[PDB]
């Protein structure tokens, strides 16, 4: 894990990912937009920041008038963070805590905490853990921004997707590659291509059947909760067709004193960098219009700061069933 | 760190897609095979140490070529892999494959020729040379070593174009107001980041600004620890007049055999490979009159992450417009 | 076999085919100046134009002093013949016939046959026997020209083309297209391209030893002659690697009283519309430089207008051996 | 002659290749899978005929759709593949491969759906539709048939290029000395030729100077007999001033299923398939104005090489300025 973790926090040291996350208008604007339209929530109060970054969701804060901000941060990009304060003239109001929020020293309790915890399907980098550990520091009143999250799932069909695989993986079926016989390693191959979720975006039609919503309440949901997820799911299908897998997409709500503020990486949403998630079937699942896809979606956290996903998924009336493995640390970003 | 990087270097190559994505490279796959057969006296009934096997393609070479026994010294999880292939191919009698690093294995016997793939982006780039080096000790007196030299080639180079749009990216961090926070007091930082980021792609060869210098390793005699600190001085008489941007690096190796000389160029007036080429940018270029002379020096220090903090220090010596710059071969920009 | 020839003699029907036969300045300007440097054996002789087409080879012929051409023609092409004997005011030395050279009436025997019988790999369309059977109309002293066929065969190592087949065969395994498993068709798919002679042209490198010479000439063989055609080989390679199948050309020699003219297919000579034909081994076989490769190419005129191919070669130091059958009436056209 | 271009054209569907080349048009096999499984009602326990299967893709659509019974009838050899993909997906239940021409063969019931591929270049080329239409003779009196129906679009075009193109090939027979001979008396015929060659290729729309005339083919109402001459009036409301080179020719078929009607267009207006669009020029181009009116006639007329002789007449009805034309839809110029 020690490993995974180190390379995670040498990634996030590098001012390009600040600026091509911040460069993201549904994130960046999204996340003033809750801030300032719930000023009553951050007027006069203390905040903890948690994985600041660059420091801009503090900054927000102290638009919104917050008394003083705590904004922790584990990589390098704290020290900048620090320069950003200076600059700004908001020394007074923000303090930059270099480390982890599981292992630094707050001197005080907040009245709410903010983070942008969110990875691919929501849950990839395991950061949510790491935000409700940071409910150590909340006061009984306290708030999060963001306060839910909602994993949408939902049958899609792209026979090109599903053919991709097997027409890369049969680079190995040949007899004499340079005189080598390849063809041993082909079911392996095969078996890597299915375990990497694929990360772009599609069309809205691709999707079967209205999509299955999974909701965890920051506000109640205890760190140990995200290390093992299981998701329910039984599709209605709207469509007749084969079923190549599942989609994946998110939303977050900031509800705050005023306002709810909704962030959606929806595919009928604008383009987001977190995109939409899809694990493949390892067979395709025919469906009737009418008929139900009933399974579950189990995410079990993984030493590499990621789940393995099992999907289980069955056409009802019919028996046939499909069973896939993935892991979301490698997955396969096909968006060009 | 050193245990950090290794972990996620060899995760890397564990996968069979890293595989097909090398060996589908027809002049590197392609030259190592003309390299081992038509030097196959090189191989005829001789003992061979494959470092680094992967999958086992060069191993295979030497099988075909001849070889009595070729001990395949893998670290990766591909060596399963390539054990699969070895029974597949009938090959059990011949091909050994040893899990492990080829610093920690034993071998059973000492071998009449190595055979590796060692070059990385720069030739250097993964530090695999070492490794190589390190194999000499189970080398016998009259032995060989295929590649047995390393050419890197140096050029000045005039893109405008690309010096733009690294100055564009770091240009965001000049923001005063970015959703109303300061962000200028970066900037220098974040041009230092963008500009330490080598670029790895091709060009025309119209954009060298004089003819290469080239640097020679020869891995027959080169001792591992030489490559802790390499220094390459160059002088470089320039043809064109013009702004210096930078300097643009290529390799070849040559496999000096018995019956034949076969080189693997991966430079700018030769396909393709995937090397491509790669160019380090001064963060403000050098204006150099043709028949002037641009010397400086080039200085790779091995540091923990299996690569190379590269120091390239260049100036017009009529002028004395002087550059320094500083190079993090472990954050490339794929330019494509 | 009538199926076939009514669509042969419907192919040679249309005026485009013509052109763009006369527009190989190969073929044309050859011909003219094989006829015109020879004029002595045209000077107010009789001479029979065997599938003469739009009539060029006759006008030739005419224009180095014959005094009476019959040229044969059973497309309906030999219509426009006719048209252009009037046109160019040839009629009183000019005769065109329509219908084929084994069934028309020639009222005189002729001093000398001239055709252009040539198909891939000098053998297809079989028009070649069309030509001797016009022997039986040829006088005593009586000349042919073309005089001479050789047909080059040679081992050739193209490790792409070979891949090639493979890549295309591979559609087919796939266990769900469309919810449909193709795999059990794969290995058929393999054969159905392995069957195909390729038509294209190459860089004379990927020859790997001195070509092999069969030849037929046409004053002295006989029509049964070419139902079977036995070419022993026996390559001495001048380089070291994989064999990947035989590479085809062929020359045609005008052997006249004055001078003999040679029109060359080659890949040595500029491009024709013959290309080169290359034939792949199902197997590669390997072979070091001085090896020999020994074997038969086999060709079995069949009821296509065409001929079965059967290969079979083996490398003798090694007794590894590659067996082939191809259908030259199905050739894949890979020049683009 | 009819028995040697059936010869000619069964022989060429026998290849495998023809097969994956067909079914690699995404649009043709997965519009019909989504017309087959949107309808599964129309195939749930139904008795199904399918006209020149092939490899049987659409017999397995209909199985997967619940087909109880499917009788799959080919002519050519690919039958055989068939039964394979029958055995190998464990269909041999409920798909039944009958070989030979469907007007020959017997099937032991009448069925209650006929589903086929009928459709050529220009939607009538290689007169399946015939044999299609034939099938009526085992449809059921409440039956349907997949496709139901097509419609022929014709709308004039410019494009000054094309005609250049085919005007300069017929030009090679203008020449007074090529080699010294004088084809001129020619030319007329080989402009003849060359603008008898339907060019099947894609365009942009832009280049059609007129709203589409359709022309519907009603399936289920059409007898066999009526495709022996078929009559297509057409008047066009001239959108644009210039130059009419002639007509461009796609099509559509809907299947009209109880649950949906699903349309494959091979429009201009929508993805490219193989069957491209088809444009007949003028020998002539018409000059019209808009606002006028572009009248006249498309005749098919089927002859005996499995395809139309067609006459297109058309005349700018304001200047009486008429243009008569011949194609010869066998002979096809694939201009890609
Ligand atoms: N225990 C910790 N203590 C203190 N800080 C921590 C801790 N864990 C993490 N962090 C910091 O939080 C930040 C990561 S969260 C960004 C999550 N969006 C990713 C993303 C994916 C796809 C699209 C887009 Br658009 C954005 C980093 O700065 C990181 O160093
Ligand atoms: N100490 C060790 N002992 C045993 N094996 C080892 C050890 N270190 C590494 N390896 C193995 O050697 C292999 C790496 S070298 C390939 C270097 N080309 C990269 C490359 C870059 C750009 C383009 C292209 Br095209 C290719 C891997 O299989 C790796 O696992
Ligand atoms: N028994 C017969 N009696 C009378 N005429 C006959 C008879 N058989 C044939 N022909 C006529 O000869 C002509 C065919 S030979 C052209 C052979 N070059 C092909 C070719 C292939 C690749 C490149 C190039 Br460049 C040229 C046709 O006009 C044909 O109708
Ligand atoms: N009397 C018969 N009885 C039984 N089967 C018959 C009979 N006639 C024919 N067939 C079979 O039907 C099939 C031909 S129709 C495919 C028509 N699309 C062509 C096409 C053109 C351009 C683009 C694309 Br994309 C596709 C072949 O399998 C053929 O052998």
């Known amino acids: 894990e020690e490993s995974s973790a180190v390379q995670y926090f040498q990634f996030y040291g590098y001012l390009s990912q600040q600026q091509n996350m911040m460069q993201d208008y549904v994130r960046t604007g999204?996340?003033?937009?809750?801030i300032l339209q719930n000023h009553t929530d951050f007027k006069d109060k203390i905040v903890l920041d948690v994985g600041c970054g660059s420091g801009i969701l503090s900054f927000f804060a102290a638009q919104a008038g917050a008394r003083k901000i705590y904004a922790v941060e584990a990589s390098t990009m704290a020290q900048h963070a620090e320069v950003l304060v200076k600059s700004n003239?908001?020394?007074?109001?923000?303090?930059?805590?270099?480390?982890?929020?599981?292992?630094?020293?707050?001197?005080?309790?907040?009245?709410?905490?903010?983070?942008?915890?969110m990875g691919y399907m929501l849950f990839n980098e395991r950061?949510?853990?790491?935000?409700?550990?940071?409910?150590?520091?909340?006061?009984?009143?306290?708030?999060?921004?963001?306060?839910?999250?909602?994993?949408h799932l939902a049958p899609f069909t792209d026979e090109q997707l599903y053919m991709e695989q097997f027409?890369?993986?049969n680079f190995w079926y040949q007899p004499s590659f340079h005189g080598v016989d390849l063809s041993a390693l082909r079911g392996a191959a095969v078996d890597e291509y299915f375990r990497q979720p694929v990360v772009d975006t599609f069309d809205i039609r691709i999707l079967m059947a209205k999509s299955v919503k999974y909701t965890v309440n920051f506000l109640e949901a205890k760190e140990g909760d995200l290390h093992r997820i299981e998701i329910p799911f039984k599709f209605h299908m709207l469509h007749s067709g084969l079923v190549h897998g599942l989609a994946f997409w998110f939303d977050?709500?900031?509800?705050?004193?005023?306002?709810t503020v909704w962030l959606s990486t929806a595919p009928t949403?604008?383009?987001?960098?977190?995109?939409?998630?899809?694990?493949?079937?390892?067979?395709?699942?025919?469906?009737?219009?009418?008929?139900?896809?009933?399974?579950?979606?189990?995410?079990?956290?993984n030493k590499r700061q990621s789940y393995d996903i099992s999907i289980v998924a069955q056409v009802d009336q019919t028996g046939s069933k499909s069973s896939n493995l993935l892991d979301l640390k490698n997955p396969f970003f096909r968006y060009t």
Chains 1, 3 share one sequence.
């Open 89 to 117: 003239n908001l020394t007074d109001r923000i303090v930059v805590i270099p480390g982890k929020v599981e292992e630094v020293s707050l001197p005080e309790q907040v009245d709410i905490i903010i983070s942008e915890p």
């Open 127 to 151: 950061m949510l853990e790491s935000y409700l550990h940071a409910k150590k520091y909340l006061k009984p009143s306290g708030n999060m921004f963001p306060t839910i999250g909602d994993v």
């Open 269 to 301: 949403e604008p383009l987001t960098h977190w995109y939409q998630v899809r694990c493949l079937f390892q067979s395709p699942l025919f469906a009737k219009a009418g008929d139900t896809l009933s399974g579950t979606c189990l995410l079990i956290a």
């Open 167 to 169: 027409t890369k993986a």
């Open 30 to 34: 999204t996340y003033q937009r809750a």
């Open 252 to 259: 977050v709500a900031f509800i705050g004193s005023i306002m």
